[PDB]
Design a protein around this ligand. Sequence first.
Ligand code: HEM
Ligand code: HEM
Ligand code: HEM
Ligand code: HEM
Lengths: 146, 146, 141, 141
Amino acid sequence: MHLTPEEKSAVTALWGKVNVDEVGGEALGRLLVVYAWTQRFFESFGDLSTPDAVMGNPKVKAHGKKVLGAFSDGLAHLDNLKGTFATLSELHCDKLHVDPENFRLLGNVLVCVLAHHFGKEFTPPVQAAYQKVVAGVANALAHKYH
Amino acid sequence: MHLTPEEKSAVTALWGKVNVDEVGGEALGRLLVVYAWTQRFFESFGDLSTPDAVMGNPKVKAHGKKVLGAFSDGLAHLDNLKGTFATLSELHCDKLHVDPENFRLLGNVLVCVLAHHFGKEFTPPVQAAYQKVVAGVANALAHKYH
Amino acid sequence: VLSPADKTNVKAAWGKVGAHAGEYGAEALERMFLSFPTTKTYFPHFDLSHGSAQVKGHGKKVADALTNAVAHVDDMPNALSALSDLHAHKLRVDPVNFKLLSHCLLVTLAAHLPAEFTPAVHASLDKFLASVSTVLTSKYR
Amino acid sequence: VLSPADKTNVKAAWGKVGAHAGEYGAEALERMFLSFPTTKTYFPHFDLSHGSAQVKGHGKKVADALTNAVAHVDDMPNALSALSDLHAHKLRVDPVNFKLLSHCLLVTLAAHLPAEFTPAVHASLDKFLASVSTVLTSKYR
Ligand code: HEM
Ligand code: HEM
Ligand code: HEM
Ligand code: HEM
């Protein structure tokens, strides 16, 4: 992860201020609303016909928290994303059959959610470092696909 | 660039039968015919208005030969694509201002050209190995962009 | 948009394909699964081994739909309507994948049609598959 | 394709942008050049330093073309015909880059319009920018 010290530092300080429960739920929710076809993996979560239904769905919120929690743990392993997410990569491929393009879409939604939450503080340099992290995570999650 | 020994053998074997001069001219010409916007880089080459004008243009043929000659040289250094192409990467970014997406388009056109020339011999497994190689070269040429 | 010359090129090339369509569809699929393994996530219920009957059967279906689009080249959005609904509402394949299959179909045609696959025809076919992909993806959201 | 609700969401969000369009346009550009450095290849004649007047002026132009698109949402291909010709025949920017600018404009809006950037409006704006990109690359070949 060709991350610069000033870049690593930017990611870390911002993240220390994130409410993972809220952001996770908001990220996964926006993904399902903005890119409707991603709902194909979540038929069993219930009603998702409208944005209000998606955003309020308790299983959506809870799954978002779990996803972002694993993302969070990965931010402590920025020198070894591949090794950290290897097991998860295999599961996403072998059991869940999730097209990795989904990981890129969530990345970008995540970035929009961070900007929405932090406004001013989410300056261009800070976005740039986060784009590198989100692509890094997506790439590690896809690494074990075969 | 994870290439298995059997993939590397398949790539090298086929490449030994390629007339780089001719294939170079075809690939570059086809890029300019199929993705007409890539002509933005070659306004000094003269007439590029019809397929015959592009394909028979001596400057396109000569540039194609130069491009593919560098690419072959790369096939002799599959374990160090990044180092091999470092100065060319710099040049394409700082002096020529070429959007790296162009290297990916050329890679896919080259794959069609190999398919066209070799027919049956360009089996699904052989194509898969070439797809990894063209992506590897594209990634190496992009690595010095900033 | 397809030009008159593009339409001519596509009918000519596809007419040479003729009664091999199905076979070429299956090859395009195999090529795709091997070159771009992430595409396999959409076919977990298939046997994907070489010579698989499910792969053969699905190849024919894909090839028949392309034949139909060629037969209705001036009315593609309507000729492919049902398929557009299916992809948008049920299958929900990420749009990037269409570009991958299209590439593999082009490689397949190149490998089997040495004389027809001229630069001009290559260009027209690429445009044709891109328009088909656009239609199939037009109702996604 | 844009639904009525989409058009209503887009007009209202852009309405709140108001006199800040120019500034946001410039901000979206700066975010793009930093996040996605390959985009700088299309602007070798620009001083790309923070606060440059070329980025500022270009941000205004981009922003105003979007305003015109919002105002002409039902007739975009005609309202943007000249820009569509410009990108296809002169500038010849690779289509992939349009998604990068679109994402950066969304991030800009999200950062500046917290109450207005609801999940449904985020969806509408994403579809609108996608449509605008489609129109701008529709004459490429
Ligand atoms: C930031 C990237 C992502 C990370 C870090 C992540 C992480 C996780 C984790 C930790 C689990 C729990 C697995 C377990 O209990 O063993 C999971 C499950 C799952 N993930 Fe991902 N995920 C990501 C993105 C996605 C996306 C984009 C999709 C599809 C849109 C997806 C689909 C699923 C599905 C379908 C499950 C199984 C849910 C169930 O138990 O019913 N994931 N993910
Ligand atoms: C396989 C990928 C490629 C390789 C290995 C390659 C290699 C080369 C080489 C060896 C040169 C000559 C360098 C010099 O003059 O010092 C060159 C020049 C150039 N390349 Fe690339 N190239 C590749 C792809 C492309 C693509 C796809 C484009 C644009 C679509 C492009 C645009 C150019 C241009 C405009 C020049 C300068 C031509 C001139 O002399 O006026 N290259 N390249
Ligand atoms: C040239 C573009 C494509 C065309 C013309 C096409 C056409 C078709 C047709 C005719 C069917 C059969 C529907 C039926 O039974 O009535 C089908 C189903 C299907 N397609 Fe598409 N398709 C295309 C691209 C793709 C791609 C890119 C993917 C994802 C990689 C995909 C995934 C599927 C899947 C998973 C099925 C269901 C297979 C089954 O369960 O039997 N298709 N398509
Ligand atoms: C929403 C998408 C976009 C819109 C609405 C847009 C609109 C415009 C406008 C209004 C102009 C000025 C034309 C004039 O001076 O009259 C322009 C020029 C230009 N645009 Fe696009 N643009 C978009 C995306 C892009 C992207 C993605 C790129 C490449 C990264 C790009 C590169 C350029 C360049 C290089 C110029 C010429 C700038 C100059 O030399 O001053 N544009 N565009």
